[PDB]
């Protein structure tokens, strides 16, 4: 059944709730993103008003084929109603059409519920900054100290740094680089334009990103793979073996492949600096996991949670366990004493 942390009290609002059948009482569901464990239910059938930003909304009607009649995309940094609520979504610096969204209950009562997002202090300065928030529904991906990690552009400088170097060297080698998902573009956009090439790709993959307003995007990419010298695979195929088998296919063009892994964080960083990290290497392949995150640090969500000062915090994220329920809670708390709300 439908948990607690996807229904917005006072109202007829879920978040992130398509994969329950029908809602009793829900009468708008809000979508944040277009990653699949949050949109897990939706297609073409499906008859409810789905509420979410244009870039989500794009994403629904092309690769889903949800009917048009049915999305209803708004704009962000403005104050819409909805069934009779005061909503404004928020860029939420996750993946392209993230959204965090914002109500006003007729009570009197402010919610914020950030989806997925990385914290920034860009947001202390949005209308967050206008009004108090007394219930924060907080993705706690990452809330954990243990969990550090560099600036994206401290990693974007170290992937084209590497690149640019390695190809000036032997102009024969290839990059790969992986995906799964919309999300983390600037890691294959960046090493494309220090090359001076487009990035080539699958039919699929160059459709979903025709859908995510990027400016100029036509200048940047291709289904012409012979063209490129950057290549996009699945996620999957970036291994020793994936990569042999996708060389081979190459004709003969090239004779060096270095691969990026974008993960999330891997234990690897408790201990090396971005400036250290070294590929795993087999024969002609390299493999090069790159710690670029599209959720908070430990320390970015701490920050943004001491600055916002909630009545109540509702976890979204690693919520199935009592051990990281109480571990979550404990921070939670020490929080709130040391900044004194
Ligand atoms: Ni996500």
């Known amino acids: 059944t439908c948990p607690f942390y996807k229904k917005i009290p006072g109202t007829g609002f879920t978040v992130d709730a398509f994969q329950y059948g029908v809602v009793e009482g829900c009468t708008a569901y809000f979508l944040t993103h277009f990653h699949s464990d949050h949109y897990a239910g939706l297609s073409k059938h499906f008859t409810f008003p789905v509420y979410c930003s244009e870039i989500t909304g794009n994403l629904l009607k092309n ?7 049915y999305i209803h995309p708004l704009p962000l940094d403005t104050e819409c109603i909805v069934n009779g609520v005061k909503v404004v979504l928020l860029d939420a610096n996750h993946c392209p059409g993230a959204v965090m969204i ?3 209950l007729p009570n009197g009562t402010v919610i914020l519920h950030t989806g997925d997002f990385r914290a920034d202090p860009s947001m202390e300065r ?5 009004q108090k928030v007394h219930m924060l529904y907080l993705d706690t991906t990452y809330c954990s100290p243990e969990y550090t990690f560099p600036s994206q552009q401290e990693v974007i400088r170290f992937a084209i740094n590497t690149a640019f170097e390695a190809v000036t060297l032997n102009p024969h080698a290839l990059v790969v680089c992986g995906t799964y998902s919309i999300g983390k573009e600037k890691v294959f956009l960046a090493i494309a334009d220090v090359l001076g090439s487009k990035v080539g790709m699958s039919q699929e993959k160059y459709k979903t990103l025709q859908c995510l307003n990027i400016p100029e995007i036509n200048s940047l990419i291709t289904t012409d793979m012979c063209s490129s010298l950057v290549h996009l695979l699945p996620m999957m195929q970036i291994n020793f073996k994936g990569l042999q088998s996708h060389l081979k296919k190459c004709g003969g063009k090239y004779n060096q492949i270095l691969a990026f892994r974008p993960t999330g964080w891997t234990h690897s960083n408790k201990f090396t600096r971005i ?7 087999k024969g002609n392949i390299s493999i090069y996991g790159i710690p670029y995150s599209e959720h908070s640090s430990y320390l970015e969500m701490k920050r943004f949670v001491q600055w916002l000062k909630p009545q109540k915090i509702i976890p979204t994220v690693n919520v199935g366990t009592w051990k990281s329920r109480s571990t979550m809670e404990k921070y939670f708390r020490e929080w709130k004493l040391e900044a004194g709300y």
């Open 275 to 281: 400036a250290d990290v070294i590929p795993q290497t």
């Open 126 to 130: 949005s209308l967050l900054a206008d």
């Open 63 to 69: 690769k889903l084929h949800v009917q048009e009649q």
């Open 102 to 104: 914002l109500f006003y």
